[PDB]
Amino acid sequence: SSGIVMADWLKIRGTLKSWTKLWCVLKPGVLLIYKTQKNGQWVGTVLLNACEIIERPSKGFCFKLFHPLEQSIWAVKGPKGEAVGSITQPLPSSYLIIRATSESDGRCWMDALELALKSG
């Protein structure tokens, strides 16, 4: 009933190239990012509807979510009404660079992300 298409750890490159491991959940039209896997501290929600996706060779496997018009990709409000995201390494306003453990995992995420873009 959840509507959760995918959930797994992904590494997200900050502006500070710290590659933090964060818990990521995919629901139609949104990617929800958390510090921890269960009942986690919300960091941000990416509005996939405003986004396009491109592959980024080469290390594992990296892909980039970006706003084609260089605008903000981020939800104003948390899934639970949260005003502000949990503090993390600084992240870009208009794009996100993401890494997955395996090529197969990465391709799955990416394909799933593609469908998710125009739904919700």
Residue numbers in the entry: 6 to 64, 67 to 127
Recite the paper's sentences.
The oxysterol-binding protein (OSBP) and its related proteins (ORP, for OSBP-related protein) have emerged as central regulators of sterol/lipid transport at the junctions formed by ER with other organelles. ORP5 and ORP8 possess the structural features of a lipid transporter: an ER anchor (TMD), a membrane targeting pleckstrin homology (PH) domain and a lipid-binding module (ORD, for OSBP-related domain). Indeed, ORP5 and ORP8, and their yeast counterparts Osh6p and Osh7p, have recently been reported to mediate the counter transport of PtdIns(4)P/phosphatidylserine (PtdSer) between the ER and plasma membrane (PM): ORP5/8 was shown to transfer PtdSer from the ER to PM, coupled with backward transport of PtdIns(4)P from PM to the ER, resulting in its hydrolysis by the phosphatase Sac114–16. Critical to the transport function of ORP5 and ORP8 is their recruitment to the ER–PM MCSs.
A distinctive feature that stands out, however, is the presence of an unusually long 25 amino acid stretch forming an extended β6–β7 loop (His209–Ser236). The analogous surface on the Osh3p PH domain has a neutral charge suggesting that ORP5 and ORP8 PH domains may possess a distinct PtdInsP-binding mechanism. Close inspection of the distinct positively charged cavity of ORP8 PH domain shows the amino acids forming the basic patch are lined on the β1–β2 and β5–β6 loops (non-canonical mode). Structure-based sequence alignments of related PH domain containing LTPs ORP5, ORP8, OSBP, Cert, and Osh3p establish that the putative PtdInsP residues (red inverted triangles) in ORP5 and ORP8 PH domain are not conserved in OSBP, Cert, and Osh3p. Notably the side chains (green triangles) mediating canonical PtdIns(4)P interaction with OSBP, Cert, and Osh3p are missing in ORP5 and ORP8. To confirm the importance of the non-canonical basic surface for PtdInsP binding, we designed point mutations R136Q, R179Q, and R158Q, R201Q in the ORP5 and ORP8 PH domains, respectively. Both the point mutations in ORP5 and ORP8 PH domains completely abolished the binding to PtdInsPs, confirming that ORP5 and ORP8 PH domain follows a non-canonical PtdInsP-binding regime.
